[PDB]
């Protein structure tokens with residue numbers, strides 16, 4: 001491989017310890033190393049306080065300082081250094097105090113500079129058995145942050161693990177608490193589930209855990225997911241969900257999509273409702289919308305080639321505009337222009353009228 005994150009984190013730990021502080025790799029990096037995977041991120045936990053970290057490193061980003069977190073920039077990587085803490089934020093004085101309030105045992109391990117695993121809650125055994133289990137009392141972990149309930153669902157698909165039975169029954173009992181979680185955090189976890197492996201298992205856990213009873217419009221996630229295959233874009237999960245149920249975008253708008261996301265969903269839904277697609281269809285809709293609609297209805301056409309082979313790609317290529325029509329018509333500017341521009345546009349897109357000012361003028365003077 002060519003990873004640098006672990007190496008950089010080792011250097012960060014070394015500098016922290018050279019200055020008298022304790023420092024360890026924590027979080028998913030430890031889980032990933034034990035799974036033989038290359039970590040996406042490597043967090044460091046330290047007895048150093050944020051301003052003490054800033055003294056030791058030339059380049060830091062300080063946005064999370066209130067939470068105890070300094071981002072250390074080193075060797076072209078960024079390592080998050082967080083003081084021992086628990087969230088609710090309270091700084092604490094030992095590693096174990098920090099670890100004992102984390103969500104799941106596989107996420108509550110630490111590793112030293114010398115590769116020793118500190119695993120007070122059996123993270124290694126659960127990792128080996130492929131079990132997502134809350135640290136300590138699950139009722140406690142889920143009251144501290146109800147989003148953890150949904151995180152457990154997400155990890156089951158992402159790692160192909162099961163959810164520990166006691167933990168899962170705890171989620172069932174506290175699923176109501178999900179109502180307090182910012183919808184942006186909910187959407188972020190669901191977007192991950194939609195692109196992760198084993199997503200059908202994640203969706204069955206979502207239902208079995210009772211989360212679908214209390215998530216915003218939670219019942220809508222209970223569709224048949226067998227024929228869903230992610231395209232790497234979480235948006236396709238939301239469109240698949242709606243299409244399977246013959247529902248419209250407004251039914252999921254609680255999740256606070258961006259305008260472009262919403263447009264992509266709404267336009268794709270339109271395409272799936274349109275009986276037959278022709279040149280104007282391929283002209284007016286984006287490739288991304290055409291491809292997502294094709295994906296969700298099961299078509300496999302070579303969409304890109306059809307769009308590319310149209311006479312023009314967009315309105316900016318049109319050889320005529322409203323002010324040419326004002327000249328030829330002798331009429332004052334008004335909404336009629338858009339009507340007539342579109343007539344001309346259609347004729348060009350269907351390859352009937354040449355995209356040529358003088359020939360469009362001929363057509364117009366004859367039609368008007």
Ligand SMILES: Nc1ccn([C@@H]2O[C@H](COP(=O)(O)CP(=O)(O)OP(=O)(O)O)[C@@H](O)[C@H]2O)c(=O)n1
Nearest residue numbers: 027028029040101102103104107108145147148
């Ligand atoms: N609610 C939470 C959120 C986080 N944590 C703890 O913070 C660490 C970093 O999570 P993180 O959010 O920074 C990345 P993660 O979500 O684990 O996915 P990835 O590693 O596959 O990229 C996790 O390992 C948990 O121990 C927690 O105890 N309760």
